[PDB]
Structure 1
Amino acid sequence: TIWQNYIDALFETFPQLEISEVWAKWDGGNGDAKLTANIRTGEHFLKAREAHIVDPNSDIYNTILYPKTGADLPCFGMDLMKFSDKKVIIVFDFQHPREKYLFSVDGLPEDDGKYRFFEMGNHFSKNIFVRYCKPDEVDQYLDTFKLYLTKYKEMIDNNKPVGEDTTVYSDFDTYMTELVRGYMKNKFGEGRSEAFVNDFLFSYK
């Protein structure tokens, strides 16, 4: 995968997040598409849920860390998406569970507001990070990603949250579910795509 350095950085920062379930291994596409879905658990987190899909023209790593509750911490989410042979979109952010709550982190870049990608202040922070690039270029943004990870580890470590109330994340998982799902439908079928979104991606609704 073109995302190996991101994945390595994520689990260097959070070595406690160990695979607790391999939720799915699926073939799809022409199968020439392979999907891996893992649930990871470990100190300070309810779960990290990691989706990784590859085919001849795509490489998608979609992962959200859901911290334990009661410290009002955000999730950390990323959608690292090679979607064609020559194109990638990279998105990562601190995604707060509370609707309409504006979050930010001192010392991180702030989006300039030139492009309207996501609803700022509603499960996306001032520091939303969105870039398009070539597959050949994806590590240009690795250093910035590592800085985000450093700030997230600091807030997790400072707070040591212990709550296990998954309903904290209901509004967030509903919102993300509502946010065509063309890729998944085309490759794995309408049924498996629906199960993937509801039972794995956003299962706290």
Structure 2
Amino acid sequence: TIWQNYIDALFETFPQLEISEVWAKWDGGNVTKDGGDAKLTANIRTGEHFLKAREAHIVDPNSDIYNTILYPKTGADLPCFGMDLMKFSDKKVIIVFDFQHPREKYLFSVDGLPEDDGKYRFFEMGNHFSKNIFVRYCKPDEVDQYLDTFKLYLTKYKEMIDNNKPVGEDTTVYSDFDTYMTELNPVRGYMKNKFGEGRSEAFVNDFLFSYK
């Protein structure tokens, strides 16, 4: 996968996050002699200071998408750390990552990180996305140009986690957030095409954004 260095950086920063469940291993897309050409792996990880990290990785002949959110334990008003690393074709990649605060309409920021006040195709800036939302468009062979920046975001996130050491397990903290992410989101339709209506619905509601 072109995302392997991002994935390794994430779990180098947070080595406590171990796989606790494989929620799905699915084949879909066009069926050939070998089976479906689209593959989904959906993992749940757990570990010190986190409620869960949920990691979805979808790969087919043209695309490679890694959608992952880290949900910290509650009690410290911490944001989640979210990423949507999207290769759509051999020419087109979009990288998104951000601190996603669970409180509706609260503008979160971190001093010293890149700032972006632009407006994007889906979602509402400033509402569960921060002043430092990082969105870049590039080609597949260029993605690691932004790796050092992703590593800075991870460094600041680990500082927040380690400085607070949250122990709460109140999943309702994330209900507004998971509801917002569900409504606003191109995922559902793409998954329905490749994997079918029922599998798409369960993926969005019971795996990606299950704290609604």
Q: Shorter-chain TM-score: what band?
A: over 0.9
Identical-residue share of aligned pairs (%) = 100
Deviation at 1:121, TM superposition (A): 1.9
Provide TM-score, normalisation by structure 1: 0.97
Could you give the per-residue CA deviations for residues 91-134 of structure 1, whole angstroms, max 9, x where no partner exists?
00000000000100011100043766642221000000001111
1-side partners of 2:191 and 2:108: how far apart?
31
Residue 119 of structure 2 contacts residue 125 of structure 2 at CA under 8 Å; is this kept in 1?
no
Residue 59 of structure 2 contacts residue 65 of structure 2 at CA under 8 Å; is this kept in 1?
yes
Deviation at 1:85, TM superposition (A): 2.3
Provide TM-score, normalisation by structure 2: 0.94
Please give the secondary structure, in 2, of the residue aligned with 1:51: strand
Residue 107 of structure 2 contacts residue 130 of structure 2 at CA under 8 Å; is this kept in 1?
yes
Could you give the per-residue CA deviations for residues 147-199 of structure 1, whole angstroms, max 9, x where no partner exists?
00000000000000000000000000000000173321111011100010000
2-side partners of 1:124 and 1:114: how far apart?
11
User: Which residue matches 2:205?
Assistant: 198
Please give the secondary structure, in 1, of the residue aligned with 2:39: strand
Compare 142-151 and 182-191 and name the one that shifted more. 182-191
Would the alpha carbon gap of residues 115 and 194 (structure 1) be closer, same or farther in structure 2, given more than 3 Å must change?
Answer: closer
Could you give the per-residue CA deviations for residues 23-55 of structure 1, whole angstroms, max 9, x where no partner exists?
100000010001000000000000000000000
Q: CA RMSD in A?
A: 1.2
Deviation at 1:90, TM superposition (A): 0.6
2-side partners of 1:29 and 1:115: how far apart?
28
2-side partners of 1:186 and 1:84: how far apart?
17
1-side partners of 2:119 and 2:203: how far apart?
33
Would the alpha carbon gap of residues 5 and 42 (structure 1) be closer, same or farther in structure 2, given more than 3 Å must change?
Answer: same
2-side partners of 1:96 and 1:115: how far apart?
18
Please give the secondary structure, in 1, of the residue aligned with 2:88: strand
Residue 73 of structure 2 contacts residue 168 of structure 2 at CA under 8 Å; is this kept in 1?
yes
1-side partners of 2:169 and 2:89: how far apart?
39
Would the alpha carbon gap of residues 56 and 116 (structure 1) be closer, same or farther in structure 2, given more than 3 Å must change?
Answer: closer
2-side partners of 1:134 and 1:118: how far apart?
23
Please give the secondary structure, in 2, of the residue aligned with 1:33: strand
Could you give the per-residue CA deviations for residues 60-100 of structure 1, whole angstroms, max 9, x where no partner exists?
00000000001000000000000122101110000000000
Q: Unaligned 5+ residue runs, structure 1?
A: none
Q: Unaligned 5+ residue runs, structure 2?
A: 31-35
2-side partners of 1:123 and 1:92: how far apart?
12
Please give the secondary structure, in 2, of the residue aligned with 1:29: strand
